[PDB]
Amino acid sequence: MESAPIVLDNGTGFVKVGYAKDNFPRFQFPSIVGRPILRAEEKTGNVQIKDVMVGDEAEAVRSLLQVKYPMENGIIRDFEEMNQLWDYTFFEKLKIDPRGRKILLTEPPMNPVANREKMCETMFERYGFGGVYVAIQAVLSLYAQGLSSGVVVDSGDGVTHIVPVYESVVLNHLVGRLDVAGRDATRYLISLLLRKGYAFNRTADFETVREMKEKLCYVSYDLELDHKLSEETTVLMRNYTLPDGRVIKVGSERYECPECLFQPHLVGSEQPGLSEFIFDTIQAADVDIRKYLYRAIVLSGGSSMYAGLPSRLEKEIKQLWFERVLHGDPARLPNFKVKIEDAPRRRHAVFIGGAVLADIMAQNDHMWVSKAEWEEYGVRALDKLGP
């Protein structure tokens, strides 16, 4: 294929993988590992299950598997299962020998140091990569825009994180985590459907409500209007057929599920939701740069894909500036400019930006942490990878 640097978005819900200059993931698959189970469920001779089965091999066959996730909240929870994802990623998805290759990895901005350390150790000491770079996921989503300033908010399966950038300087003191994302919204959909008498407690059923959420949920633009369509009308009602063949009815849960991003208290969090987390972040930036951050609020990651989320977010920031800056005086509201950037490709902006950055540093061999540098400095070799 090519001698290029490999780029790997080892995300909490999905792995995405490919090479420098790729305009889209070469492969993308669930970051899941499966073990064989029997469960008072259908069985046939038309398949065979190995003692470890992962990614697409697990997701297509998950009725037969104990499904587990090697990651949660942007951190590796189990490196023994993460080793099985990385084996699968290199040896039977890419079908590559890692020996002496250079690889670009990704993580969110406020992880434990042990996550990056043991992840780089694994690249040098299981796979024998010749060099590694680890990039902050949301600065890659800005490389995908071809853009040097704006506040970039990335919401995936594990974490929602925000990174203000101005004139290519990253405002590291302003970066933050909202510990609500696509998995919390999926756990909330299970909780809301449980009030309707449905049950989804099997490890294989989490991917079923993920696909249901991803098909049927949307962000209410106006809560009292969606509550009116919900309580006065049947128009929000929708049928979903599970891979069982069972049919379930879903109504208010379609707007009530993703509302936990804009109202985290619905999932028990005390943090402010997306609009107020983004506003408190921009409003903490210096006076001379606030306008440039409001004129480029860059959305990223799969949990930014709910229908109406850009519309609600733009409105709710105008509405929050009107409360907290103008104190309810209409006369200056038309002068406040905000622009949500909401590209079609934005679920993959971290990969697409990693494929840009990995090309920009492909020839600059000193930019990567080397295997020869790792084996003499250990974890102190990673002090190259920013502050």
Partner: protein, 151 residues
Amino acid sequence: TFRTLDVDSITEPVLTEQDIFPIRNETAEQVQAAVSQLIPQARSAIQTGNALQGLKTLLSYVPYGNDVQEVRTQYLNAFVDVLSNIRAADIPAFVKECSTEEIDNIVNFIYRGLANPQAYNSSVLLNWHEKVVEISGIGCIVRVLNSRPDL
């Protein structure tokens, strides 16, 4: 809390009805005089027993506008009074000789009549509705759905 503050009403002004429907090219006192010339003809045609010619003359002009409810309701009083005085056997012969624009005006003003039963006799307006829709078809109601809101 911020969620309830209407920003859209001031940051993105929506289309008005006069952006969809063209402005009336006549002043309020100019249309009020034009109707005040017609109502006496419409009343007089009842006394001579020519209520069919009473409608044909009254229907030659129609008032519209949110600034003219008093003369619109006076025109509707005359319209329902004229329709109440035409014999039910004359309706089929009269409807087939109306233009598409006269029919559109009849089915519009029987609709304004049906909206206010404490003022207007619905029984004659429903009899007119049956015969106008039977002879001229469904499209005359479709033209009322699509019609101007200040008729």
